[PDB]
Amino acid sequence: PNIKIFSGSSHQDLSQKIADRLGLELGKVVTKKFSNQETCVEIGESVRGEDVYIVQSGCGEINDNLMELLIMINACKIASASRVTAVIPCFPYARQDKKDKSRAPISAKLVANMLSVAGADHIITMDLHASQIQGFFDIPVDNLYAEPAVLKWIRENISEWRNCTIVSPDAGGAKRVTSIADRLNVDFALIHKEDRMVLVGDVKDRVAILVDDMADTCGTICHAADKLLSAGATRVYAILTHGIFSGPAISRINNACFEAVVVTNTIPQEDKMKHCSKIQVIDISMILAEAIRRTHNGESVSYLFSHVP
Amino acid sequence: PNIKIFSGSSHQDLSQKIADRLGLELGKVVTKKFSNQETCVEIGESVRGEDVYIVQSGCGEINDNLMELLIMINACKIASASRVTAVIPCFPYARQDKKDKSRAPISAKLVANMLSVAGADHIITMDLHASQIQGFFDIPVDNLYAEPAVLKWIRENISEWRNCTIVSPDAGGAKRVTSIADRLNVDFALIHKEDRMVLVGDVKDRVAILVDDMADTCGTICHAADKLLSAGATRVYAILTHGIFSGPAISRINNACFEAVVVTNTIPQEDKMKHCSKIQVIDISMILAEAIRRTHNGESVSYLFSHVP
Amino acid sequence: PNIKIFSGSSHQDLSQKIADRLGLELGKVVTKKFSNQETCVEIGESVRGEDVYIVQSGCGEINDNLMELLIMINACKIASASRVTAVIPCFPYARQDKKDKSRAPISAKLVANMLSVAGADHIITMDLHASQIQGFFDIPVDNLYAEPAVLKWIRENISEWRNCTIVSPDAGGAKRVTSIADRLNVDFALIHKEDRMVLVGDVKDRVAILVDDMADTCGTICHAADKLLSAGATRVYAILTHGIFSGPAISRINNACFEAVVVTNTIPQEDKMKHCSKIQVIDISMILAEAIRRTHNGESVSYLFSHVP
Amino acid sequence: PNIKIFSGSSHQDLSQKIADRLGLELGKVVTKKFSNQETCVEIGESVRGEDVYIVQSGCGEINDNLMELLIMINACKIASASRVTAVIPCFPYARQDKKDKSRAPISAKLVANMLSVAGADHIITMDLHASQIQGFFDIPVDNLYAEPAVLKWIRENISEWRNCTIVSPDAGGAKRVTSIADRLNVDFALIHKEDRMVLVGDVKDRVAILVDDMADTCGTICHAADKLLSAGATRVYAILTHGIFSGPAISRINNACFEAVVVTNTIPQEDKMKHCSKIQVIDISMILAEAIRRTHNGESVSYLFSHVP
Amino acid sequence: PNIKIFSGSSHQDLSQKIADRLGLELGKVVTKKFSNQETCVEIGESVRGEDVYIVQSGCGEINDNLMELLIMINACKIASASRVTAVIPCFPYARQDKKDKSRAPISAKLVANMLSVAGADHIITMDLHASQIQGFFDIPVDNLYAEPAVLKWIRENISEWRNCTIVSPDAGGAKRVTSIADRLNVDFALIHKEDRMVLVGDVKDRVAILVDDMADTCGTICHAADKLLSAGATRVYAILTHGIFSGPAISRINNACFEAVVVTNTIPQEDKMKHCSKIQVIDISMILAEAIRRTHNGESVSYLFSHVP
Amino acid sequence: PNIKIFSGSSHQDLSQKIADRLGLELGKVVTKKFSNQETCVEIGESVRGEDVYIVQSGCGEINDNLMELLIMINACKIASASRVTAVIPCFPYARQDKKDKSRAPISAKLVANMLSVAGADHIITMDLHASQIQGFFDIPVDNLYAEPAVLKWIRENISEWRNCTIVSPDAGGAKRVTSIADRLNVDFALIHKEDRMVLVGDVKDRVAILVDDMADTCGTICHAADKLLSAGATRVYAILTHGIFSGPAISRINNACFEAVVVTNTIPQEDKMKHCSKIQVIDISMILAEAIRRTHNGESVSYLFSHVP
């Protein structure tokens, strides 16, 4: 079986970058809409006996992109692909991972069930909002981390990184920032709201680096940055793997004191970058390409958790 | 267990009509979108031990509405509803019911699988594009027919119906028109394309009635009507259960010779009716309400196949 | 994994032809009946790690043959075959593919479920009565077409084929005849019953060729042929992939005006050919052998939809 | 939900007896064959919301009857029956319950899987060949025993039963005979083959009673009876729940020394009784009717293991 | 269907308390071990058609108790119980809810799968370690909260509760303490380790109340209490729903400065209470009994999230 | 894919012997207990794309070992092993293979379901208590036999084996002893209890060899040996594949007249051998190693049923 990479319509540039890193052309697929807006999918080449990877991020018109992904998986499965892998850099509905007191769906579990029944044998994703989502599946799920690329960016872009501070915006994700601070051998200052915020960790005259899994409306990072600037930090950075930037996010970032808002390209960023000068993108296509290549070859994927390829 | 009717966002007016016919209020549900356009669903009342019916048609923004339906089903299922029934008047992706020579998905089967894995115990739908779709499910599926309401409309609106002709637009659905002609005791003239059309059945100086399951772009019925008017029919009617009317449909209908284009209200029609004077709507809410009531009470549903309630 | 071909008891000659075309011997299997008429199956050679193909058509004693097929699949699956494929040239219960108004089983879906639970990983079949049956499965289904062999027969056996007409007997299957007429570049005359029949398409002084998926009691083709001979066709042919010929079929064919009734050998025909001189058989063993070989080698199967091997 | 009893074609008289004991009429069902010998099933009354019991024994044309049962279950399940129970007095393929050294199917497990996928929620059967077959299902299985009726027959028909001996024909089923002997407070003599047979237990000048689950070819009981008559037993009886009597069974029984061969009516016996004067039938319709009634009412079924109703 | 409560061997006193609150006797069940230490289960009364609740906490010999629970569920399911509910006050393997960088099982998901395949239709549990565990199931899961009982205890046992502080021991569970502080209208001071600890929130001359889901080795609460006593808190309390208290826990509690260590009785505490004077128990049997009663009657369970019955 | 052998904690020496025979090192795995006695499993090497075999016998602390096996299977499955095989020399809960009149679990079926849902693709076991257990699975199960090794031991250790007698202790397993006697060409004397025992087959002045699948409390073999010594057998041997030896077994063996009690090493025997001088062990690691090697290479496993490797 050979690797076949197919792109959904959500993130074409990322799929092309992945395909170039693998020395492959993107598989021929027609992904459009019928007149009544139903998804139309046509696999333009035989996938019989091949190892198929479908790249689609949970961004943009999320329900359309998710339906397209499921329809593509189904088309490849009934076309006798030997294995079908969904490469989902940003997992849709990941924030609906529990009920907790409300008569609400667990939408992430529903998405996992739909991916399974569509025929996915394997999932590759990056920085799941909650790693318990891996347990929503019965098929293997490789949850990659942007952390090696983030560490590389910090070392090559922040001159005072040895004295900086790594700040979690909410108490929930402080595990990520502790791992990053341990890797950099720095202090991890913490922030949480009580309309007021409380911060532990000396930030005065230092650089503070907010790290989080995603920025949707940027309410979380803007409040944290306001707090940090209250406590005398010389500069504040925000680093996120998923740059969703919906709603009022671009205006809030423009009016905030961030030196830089760095995101990975798990979601296309060109349109947002046009309207916001302080957004910078870390390419993670090498990590995804290496994960695809290693799953195909039976090589260790977890080696990527700590190594930039 | 009591009947609880919940409406999705696709067809609120139909759900309200159904609820009024059952003497019930619509269940409290919040169905909206998060900032990043992910579906947000919140069941506003306990459904524990209840017989839940969720009304959502495959129309409008089809992928959003389908996701909303699946999320609502999941929310009701994990909220310990005794039974969950999807009331889907127009089944989405019904026209993708086979591959036939192409490397294509069977999207209708995927939709059936998704509805099943979401937790639906029962499906109620109207005039499935292909009744083989019933076999795509392992749960019971009640496929209702608009034919009794169509016959009622014909008898009360076409003065010359005893001399009229019932015409199938494509060879595929001529079964429907034969059943209708047998019920009315009239001739069924047939039409199919060879850019030219061929018609069997005397239509001269008579009324011809085109009957079909749906009109999407109205290419099918406009070509058939052109043929019929070539052969001297005094008036031509089109009657359809599903009035999708996407793309150039309204302009084609406006420029065509139809005396009337009658559709059921399985899909909301007010916006289309604003731009097209010859569209008339048959209310089928009584049929859906009776089906819901009979499934709840253990009464015969097939009795509705031949009786207007 | 190597190809292993096993024959059920239904069509031994077809299985042998397939095995010869693949350069293989039929696998050792004992398929008989216990005293109380329960099916007895004994796999006479190890199939561990092999790619197993079981050839059984839905003909003869259909329930016995279907049980035998399921039992063989189960025996091969629990004997650790790497993959089990049911090669079912004529799919049993294919005509019970829907309910449509009656309190009836969808027997084709039940058969698909039984094949799946027995352990079949893949289905190869020819000219399914309804291609929606492919959606009754969750495993891949390769639905082969007799059309290339039919076109070859027409070109090599009917001297006036460039002027002939391709006639559908019922409105349902006219898609097949349109494809054939497009391939031959001829007119497709159509027939359907109203005890009287209506025909469109000049057949006078021409050869008419009825094409259909199967002839069971031959009521369908005999009525169509009577109509065609009413309209002056010089000769009438019938061509079918599945020659079931049950009940009064042989007598009706003998008393009908067919120049020839051509069937494929998806069903054994020698006994019927003894009693009916106008039955001729097209061998489709090359198509089935090529499909088996291509699925085994990961080669394109759809290439066979348009090419005679 | 009300009880609905449907009969398959295998054992109509038993189904009628069961229905009379329940004070019910048999449900309207058409169970016949199409021209090509495919099973045709038509449920003649609504079963929506009802508790459906389908009576079909694994006898006669076993594969036809099994297919008919599965098709009926499927028809009732997709007709929205609240619960479907297969009442299978003699379970087909029960003797193929293991492989043991051979490359053979476990056909009983396949049958269980097929019954489950057809939609059966519950199985009622009598004297399974191996009670481990209950573990082949994931749905509940009530395995009834003919033993109370057998004990009643022994007490009312064998004058010397207090001095008799209960003999197992093969070592496998001696558990049944020990239970019977314990109930009667008598000795259980045992027999097994070494073309010679060995017997333990004084049988001289006594009545010996062979007890077994079934008599198929009667090779087992005729050999055992020959042995018993060698050792001076005044009379020999055979008692079996399942009287299959296939092959040479009737001739062997006619030429054997049995005083009586008693069977239950889990299988119709009239035709066999015509050709064999020493066959007598125990009616077990009361046990099956009580089991149906108790499962419907939520009453203890195991109470029937020791009580004649 | 009637309620039947069965106790596993893990927590007999809790099951008895639940049964008394429901006005029921515990169902007759034999739960012991064979000589080779395999679990032996015997249901001593018919459960046919009943609503069965099996009470077993994930404590003590956890693997034995989990096996016993699964075996009991299986026994009740194949005995035709109408519904089987696992009442698991402390969910076993809840802390293995993710992999996160290691080649480790997701044991909680495995436990959920095992409970589902054993036949559980419903799960009732209290204070799941991660509420995402609800998404590990496809059956409904009611995750009850000890918070109402905790609030009642605080108000009736701590005289200065209006001035107290609610402290989370680890950053992960601070959601619980924020909910509790909001209910009490007090400040929530937070603690996390950097062998040193950092605390935000004035605790000087006040009572601090540590709240957490469980105390296993009490390393978490003892370190937090040491920190709190460093910052001048007059008294420190610990309140936990699950008092596992394994390993060195009792000695650490005895040597720590806790005024009180309060636990619920989701786990039996008498043996631990013998060796530790500062352990007090909150009875939560009323909450579990109300949940059982409300699920049985189709009443709202979420009403218990905020109301002490 | 390469073979990876992992050992559970139950039988480390057997796993090492198997690994040596395959020329492999045991895979790195940490299998221990958390403080609260929950199983902790950590796979110390990548198994991605490998053929994983996990060796764990149903002995010792059976519930702990079974949980450990399931957790290891789950860890390997979600770590993307190409195939996972449970090598279970002594299958736990095998004696609970049926209900038979009691409201009891079928625990063996539950264990099979748990192994399947954990992710096992294949089971290798030795001398299942009932071979019907193979039908409890839907995955392939290779049930190996100790008989070739037993025959080898008999020929090399009992000088009078040509005149010996092979005795079944209970009527149930006499099939094993008939196969052994046929292989050795000797008589098979049989024993069963009526507190008294009955024996057929001349044993006077001969060696009697009891053969059975397992000895748990040794009540079965000690009673049989007492009977045999009553009838003048010069020596009595017992040979068993599974030496469980729980409860009073060692004392009964010490006080019994056995010349030797031979067991295989499907269960560790060193501790029991310390306290009982007449226990001897047959190594079956070559049979298990050959089965693993042959399943990996696609070679015939059934060849081992009659051949010592």
Ligand SMILES: Nc1ncnc2c1ncn2[C@@H]1O[C@H](COP(=O)(O)OP(=O)(O)OP(=O)(O)O)[C@@H](O)[C@H]1O
């Ligand atoms: N796409 C979405 N956009 C915004 N909010 C969402 C979205 N999906 C779910 N939510 C809601 O957001 C909330 C989840 O918030 P969040 O993940 O930030 O915190 P948490 O899960 O409570 O805690 P933490 O992640 O810190 O452990 C829920 O109320 C959920 O319904």
Ligand SMILES: Nc1ncnc2c1ncn2[C@@H]1O[C@H](COP(=O)(O)OP(=O)(O)OP(=O)(O)O)[C@@H](O)[C@H]1O
């Ligand atoms: N939403 C859609 N809008 C338009 N075309 C669609 C849609 N979904 C599927 N199709 C395409 O339309 C075609 C199906 O057309 P249609 O149902 O009219 O005819 P058919 O299935 O070939 O025959 P018939 O229904 O007459 O038996 C397929 O090529 C399918 O891919």
Ligand SMILES: Nc1ncnc2c1ncn2[C@@H]1O[C@H](COP(=O)(O)OP(=O)(O)OP(=O)(O)O)[C@@H](O)[C@H]1O
């Ligand atoms: N083996 C069989 N022999 C005869 N009739 C059968 C068989 N199996 C099913 N039928 C019946 O035949 C009918 C199906 O007929 P047929 O397939 O010719 O037409 P259709 O499905 O209505 O339309 P079309 O195939 O033209 O789209 C149904 O009433 C079905 O119950």
Ligand SMILES: Nc1ncnc2c1ncn2[C@@H]1O[C@H](COP(=O)(O)OP(=O)(O)OP(=O)(O)O)[C@@H](O)[C@H]1O
């Ligand atoms: N319908 C059938 N008629 C005859 N033989 C059958 C039938 N089905 C299976 N068999 C075969 O009969 C044998 C099973 O025989 P039987 O049930 O009498 O003994 P057993 O299972 O070996 O032992 P026991 O039942 O005494 O414990 C197997 O070889 C099986 O393949």
Ligand SMILES: Nc1ncnc2c1ncn2[C@@H]1O[C@H](COP(=O)(O)OP(=O)(O)OP(=O)(O)O)[C@@H](O)[C@H]1O
């Ligand atoms: N029974 C157990 N006893 C002790 N440790 C366990 C047990 N089960 C799992 N663990 C381990 O404990 C760790 C989980 O710790 P914990 O739940 O306290 O923190 P977390 O999940 O990392 O974060 P948080 O719960 O604060 O969001 C994992 O390494 C897991 O393997």
Ligand SMILES: Nc1ncnc2c1ncn2[C@@H]1O[C@H](COP(=O)(O)OP(=O)(O)OP(=O)(O)O)[C@@H](O)[C@H]1O
């Ligand atoms: N681990 C165990 N230890 C002891 N007894 C057990 C164990 N598991 C199950 N049992 C019980 O042992 C009995 C099964 O006994 P056994 O297997 O010796 O005979 P059988 O199945 O009745 O007949 P046979 O195996 O001779 O055909 C059942 O009552 C079962 O509940």
Ligand SMILES: [Mg+2]
């Ligand atoms: Mg967050």
Ligand SMILES: [Mg+2]
């Ligand atoms: Mg159409």
Ligand SMILES: [Mg+2]
């Ligand atoms: Mg046809």
Ligand SMILES: [Mg+2]
């Ligand atoms: Mg048997």
Ligand SMILES: [Mg+2]
């Ligand atoms: Mg027998």
Ligand SMILES: [Mg+2]
């Ligand atoms: Mg914690």
Ligand SMILES: [Mg+2]
């Ligand atoms: Mg046993």
Ligand SMILES: [Mg+2]
């Ligand atoms: Mg035994």
